[PDB]
Design a protein around this ligand. Structure first.
Ligand code: CA
Ligand code: CA
Ligand code: CA
Ligand code: CA
Ligand code: CA
Lengths: 319, 319, 318, 319
């Protein structure tokens, strides 16, 4: 190619900027131009397009959020919109698009490709729920946000001999809960991919009160339920005073961790390589510590999973 | 005195350990023993008393929470209680007591003195309302916790052109909301100590939407209302997508910042000096960058106030 | 006034952009325009100047460094240089100037006022080495940078039963060393403002070793000497495994802490107020937890001093 | 096996405690006793061995360093030192040893296995320089200490238009440097696994300055040389203003990142599993995102490599 475009869609995620930065610096290394599309697919329909310069990506690698913004777009679900997007792309002479994000911001990469516009997906979310890759951009940072919260709430929990339900993000995926709860010494972790028995949680807790334990932390993925209801169930059942904490959107922001920066630079650069060598309708990622690329069509079919041996581990480490 | 005691009551607070460390290591310098009372006044009543050694304050200057724990004590409000508690004191040959915390807890230090046990209070809470001091131990730390949070939500707010309501702590004091909302560039701060008008707030938001500001962030002290409510009021009015975040108890934990560690080391040492100088029924504090001790009785009558000129400042800097 | 300017001079400092943000939003409140001068005094001479919009003050409140940059200017230390400064000032209709920084930024604020140009100065340095104020914009953030490091070095020193020496910045002031070491539970602090005896230090570490203490952190202010040297004198003297860390300019950077963001916001806002009230040749600051302003020339006249009791406290707590 | 021991040798590393917690809690899950061996190998020889109880691990997951300490041991390469090692082991009824540490530690773990005593080795070092694993416990944390430093030096370098050289740790491995440099946005990265030409460095540095760039970060792995020199060199080569930061041992400390806590917890638990299945002489690890174990002698045979394509990418991204 000679010119390509880049875009972010779906939720904000720490590292997208590093991802974006990479798309650009790489294309430059190959004599290619990059045009930033703003406000995601909404921005694409709208014509929100402006060339990015070597200097528009200088000093953003550390920066959370996405400089190109992001927004939902019902219109892009229709042939109608898909059509107008390509016009606007064609208008600026853009022959290739790197789509960075999650929430089937891939559907669009696919749709686009099917209309014969070359398109590559980069995994962008905090909740690890994108196929084609073991980890997504933003997950590592989001975890350190969660366990930093876990570290703090343990300070009070220990001081006051109290039990906390912390509700983490992960709308469908229990990744955050699994990983963070493992890392915070969480003595109960409740995920969507694994059965739980509330009567079991209650007993375990009672059991520790005896064996000298007065504080306790219960990580709960939002995809399982509302922390508020869970806490209710526990205090009502144990008489222990039981606080509840919903971390919510703090999880979505922050300076991306070293893992998230490297991953974003690698992936985003891979995505460019694919466009340039003619490929399209693909999504890159990291699998088994290796760079991979896949057909979006194929990847969107792979049901998401969590490492069950780890969930097991955490139960063992926390009887 | 040759032997004294130390205890922490009311809510947890980052820096208390630094206070306790300082209470202990200062006493040692003067050849005085120090005994820890565990689990607040409940502990005192109970007899939870163990000498502290040099090696028990060997960390702990960086650690949040309180190694002496803390717990409520209905029983200590009744006379029979403090009595029982003084017995315990006498039983271990303790001649004085440093009471670190809110909230409070100065009440007990007072009644203790009245019963002829020499008692010194130290300002420990995150919300900042303990009289006899411009700032309480834990404040600076909590503020940096809230701004870390404000920073992260600004990251997502900006990418999505969304408006956030963030509910912070301070059940009766607007200190946190004021100081952090200033440090966080929050365009709206609501505190118990100053009139607010929601029509003004709403208009202000609609105004900026035009001006070109697509994201805004409202800071709200819990002592004013429920964030998950103000948010509803705003969006059920303006057409704006409004998200809400209650940070809750993450605010209570954490490694105390430099200001808090230094403040704790100072107040702690001062508190021990009072006891040794034979004085009692006092409480220490920082006032106009100078340390002061006041009669608890008087201190307890001074309504808590916030710097109205700063609140004002935050308004001017905001429109 | 209808138009002022702002610049940043001397070593950059966390929370300057907070100070800048404040200078600019505050002026906009009173219907006043702000022109930014880039690259400190060198930029003023060269007329590197651009209207700041609302726009460019962010949010940048969390950002370290200075969006206006900074650079040394030997030339401005001379009559003709200032002539160019004013020429440029007037060429843009800038009626007043807010100067943010340290290490002689104030010098220019005075000279400029002397030549009949209203200037307010704002304390901006990590080392806290600026009169007319208890704390300078950048100090709190620096201290927290230093203790994070001390905490980390405490982790490794503890595991290995080793003794470290950490050299912190400060220039001529020992504020950082005294405040951080005290916050970090250091067992030795060495500063310009207090006197020490190496033999004291030595024996004091040899003694702590007697009571079974297996690790120590000595904190040394650069203004007192090289951390490397102290490490050496000590290891030769005792035989203990002694390492030395020079944190360096790490202390200069980072997102400014809540205190630094607030101080900058207050100070900056107060600085513009002064110009608007026709006041000039003043520097803002915070003293005894109250906002104050002083005539520069006389503020610059006080030798800086540390809190002697606190140093004494830090010893008793060892 | 009813009783095993655990120890930490080599340089200390954030997450060792997490690794200990896991060794000690996993064993309890299986009704095995754990005996701590303090001060690494010098301790093993001298006895200095104490039962680890639940309480001894119930609050260390978040803590840097090693609660078991670590010390060098010249004695333990001799035959007699080892003779002494085993006696002491047999004296406490320790049927097996988990060695958590760095490289030299693996040596002794083999010698023990040879002399009829089952050992498992756990990768513990910040410099990633240990075979039988892609990453070592400590790496992630160290990287993040490095990038935060880099971030902070970016602030001052950008306001002053300075060029910086930052010396990072890694005796013979360029992993920290390469990885943090990529993460940080280094314009220049120097490491032992890959040839560099100083002149191409100066040239690459001059081309960038002529292309407008006013500030630049340069990362040097301590194994390549001394930061102060590369500083002198390029200062007098370019004339630019140039500063030198040596981070030194800060990299060694700090609360372990989510990744290091998780890795530590999986690896440590796996190490217990091995000894319990009668599989001595091994070292655990993560390779291609999968848990693995390898004969110690064999792993110790593999010269350590970095990812050349990654070093390549870092170059392309900074043109
Ligand atoms: Ca950011
Ligand atoms: Ca902080
Ligand atoms: Ca910054
Ligand atoms: Ca730690
Ligand atoms: Ca796996």
């Amino acid at each position: 190619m000679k010119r390509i475009g880049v875009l972010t869609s779906g939720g904000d995620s720490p590292g997208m900027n590093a991802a974006i930065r990479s798309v650009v610096r790489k294309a430059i290394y190959h004599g290619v131009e990059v045009y930033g599309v703003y406000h995601g697919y909404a921005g694409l329909i709208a014509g929100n397009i402006k060339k990015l310069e070597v200097g528009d990506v200088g000093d953003i690698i550390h920066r959370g959020g996405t400089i190109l913004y992001t927004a939902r777009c019902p219109e892009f679900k229709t042939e109608e919109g898909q059509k107008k997007g390509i016009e606007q792309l064609k208008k600026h002479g853009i022959e290739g698009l790197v789509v960075i994000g999650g929430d089937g911001s891939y559907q669009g990469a696919k749709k686009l490709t099917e209309h014969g516009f070359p398109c590559v997906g980069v995994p962008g979310t905090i909740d690890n729920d994108i196929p084609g890759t073991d980890f997504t951009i933003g997950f590592d940072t989001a975890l350190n946000t969660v366990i930093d919260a876990i570290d703090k709430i343990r300070d009070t929990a220990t001081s006051h001999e109290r039990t906390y339900v912390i509700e983490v993000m992960g709308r469908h995926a229990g990744d955050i809960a699994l990983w963070s709860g493992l890392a915070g010494g969480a003595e109960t972790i409740l995920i969507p991919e694994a059965d739980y028995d509330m009567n079991d949680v209650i007993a375990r807790l009672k059991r520790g009160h005896e064996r000298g334990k007065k504080h306790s932390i219960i990580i709960v993925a939002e995809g399982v339920g509302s922390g508020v209801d869970f806490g209710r169930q526990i205090q009502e059942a144990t008489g222990f005073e039981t606080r509840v904490t919903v971390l919510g959107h703090v999880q979505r922001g922050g300076s991306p961790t070293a893992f998230d920066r490297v991953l974003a630079s690698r992936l985003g650069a891979r995505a460019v390589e694919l466009l340039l060598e003619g490929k399209g309708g693909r999504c890159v990622g990291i699998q088994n510590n290796q760079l991979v690329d896949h057909d979006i069509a194929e990847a969107l079919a792979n049901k998401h999973t969590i490492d069950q041996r780890m969930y097991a581990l955490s139960k063992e480490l926390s009887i």
